[model samples]
Target: MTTITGVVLAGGKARRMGGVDKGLLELNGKPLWQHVADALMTQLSHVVVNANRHQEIYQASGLKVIEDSLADYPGPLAGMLSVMQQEAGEWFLFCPCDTPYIPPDLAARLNHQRKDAPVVWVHDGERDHPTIALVNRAIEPLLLEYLQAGERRVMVFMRLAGGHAVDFSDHKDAFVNVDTPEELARWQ
Candidate 1:
């Protein structure tokens, strides 16, 4: 099995949550990102948080926190590129910070179905979870090229690179994310 590094994609502008840091928001007492980190740590060899703001707060969780290399908050692709540049791991397993209920076997399941593909994203019954993926370090160049061209859609880049999508229909609820205050309240 390839050594995988779990990266929590926390570098997003939480415009829906009143411009506050979504990851830092409390969910049943603990921070939302803490739930993500705790879950990832159980599955991957290493874990890091991709945070743009409140770096010290995330770092205090005892895991390395990284920022996007791009000037503006381009997107999760930029965050992915930042960690890739740092050579975080042989294979990078990524998930959004808002999806706290990610299954403990997420990396294992993705790895199991990856075969020799450079990238494998998760798919629920309804749609693909492009950001929830396991990516090969070899895709670094492709991601860099895509970002340089100012194309930020993750699914588009995945398709251009012939990325595969593994189904996780049975665990669809695990992928539910809290994006707004209403969502946070409902999920809580």
Candidate 2:
């Protein structure tokens, strides 16, 4: 098994959740990002939390916390780029902080299907969860190229870089992300 670094994307502006940091929101009893970090810790060697605000709070979790190098919350790809540039790992497992119920075996399953692809994203049969992906460090150049071109869509970069999409249809609910107050209430 190859060593993988897990990244929890929590750098969003969170306009849907009333401008509050969604990852810092309480889900059940703990912060949403805490759940994500805990789950990833089970399957990966090291886990990093990507946040633009509340860095101190996130760092309190004892995991390394990173902030996007770009300004104006450039989306998940910016967070991905931040980690890719800072961390040294063969594979980088990326997942959103809002998705607290990420499967425990996510890294294992994605890594298994990665093969030689520069990136591998999760497909829930009906649709693709582009943020739920494993990116190769070798794709650093491609990521830089895309970001330099002012492109921020993660899916677009994944496709342009010849990424593979692995089917995780059996665990559809594992990718459920809570973005709004209503959605978070439902999960709680």
Candidate 3:
């Protein structure tokens, strides 16, 4: 029942995708992030996007958008940190823009594990999906320190902040990352 803020990360500089904002990439006749956002809304009441560019189109979609406070494409951690700084909600939920099929019970399942740790990450029966995570805004300073120390690895920050991993093995397909054009074409 705790309030959660969904943070959709679309801040990447898709150099490989010819600089196109991956979030705005159409899949099923809609922007890729919208798919992710729609999924997030099933579990959360408020959602915000972390985008580095194409604000006009991203904002036009109607969800609040925030850019990383730090410049130079510092990676996903910057995006998460920006949301944490804004203190959007008691708990912060995150998902990648290119990952459209996020599980409907995302926040509900993750919230179940919060009593064990401040941060909760997902494991898809294979590798960990660190970006698809939930974090307590209270650790915002911990993240700020890590960023200032130039550590951008998400898992490291997660561990340092008492991150606990919840298995989503049954929902493995939910985290499919459609980051590349080839993958995008294949997914379509």
Candidate 4:
């Protein structure tokens, strides 16, 4: 098992959820990110968070926080770049903060199917979730170029890295993400 670091993308404004930090929102008596951190601990050498503000809230988990360089929320790709810039891990187990039920073997399985290219975890029937992916650090230069070109979509840059999409049909719930109050309510 190659050493991997977990990078939780927490920079999004929960506009759909009425201006709340989805990660900080409580679920099962704990912050969503707390559960995310706990899950990542099973597979990462260390865990870091990417947030534009609210450092104190994120710091409560005791994980290092990296601020996205984007001035206007360039999306998850920007947050991911922030982590890549700071760490040199062979693989980065990326997940959105809103996904609290991440599978424990996500990193391990992705590493197994790596095949010398980046891997993006997906679900059955065209449900590709870029949020849960294993990024190969060697592709940093490509990511930098994408950021320079102002391309924020992960799938767009994923092609540049020759990424393989890993299906998660067996672990669909692990990819559950909350973006709206109804979605959060469903989790409850």
Q: What's the TM-score of every candidate structure?
A: 0.92, 0.92, 0.92, 0.88
Q: What lDDT score belongs to each candidate, Candidate 1 first?
A: 0.85, 0.83, 0.83, 0.76
Residue lDDT tens for model 1, 1-188: 54888999897544455377889988999889989989998887689888888789999979988877744436788888888887555789989889899999899899999988999999987888899999998889898888788788888899888889999999959988889667899877
Model 3 scores worst on lDDT over the 10 consecutive residues at 12-21
Cα shift from native, residue 42, model 4 (Å): 1.9
Candidates 2 and 4 compared: the better one by lDDT is 2
Report how far off residue 61 is in candidate 1 (Å). 0.7
Task: Report the lDDT of model 1 for residue 171.
Answer: 90
lDDT by residue for model 2 (1-188), tens: 54778899887554465367888988988999889999998887688988878789898878898876745436678788888888887778888888888898898888788888879999988888898898888888777778788888877888998998999999968888798777898887
Each model's number of backbone clashes? 0, 0, 0, 0
Off by over 4 Å in 3: 13-18, 71-73
Q: Candidate 3 residues 1-188, lDDT tens each?
A: 54888989887554565366678888878888999999998888888898878778889978888876745436788888887877556788999898898988889889886776889988889888898998887778888888888888888888889888898899858878898767888777
Decreasing lDDT order of the candidates:
1, 2, 3, 4
Error of 4 at 43 (Å): 2.2
Better of 1 and 4 by TM-score: 1
Best by lDDT: 1
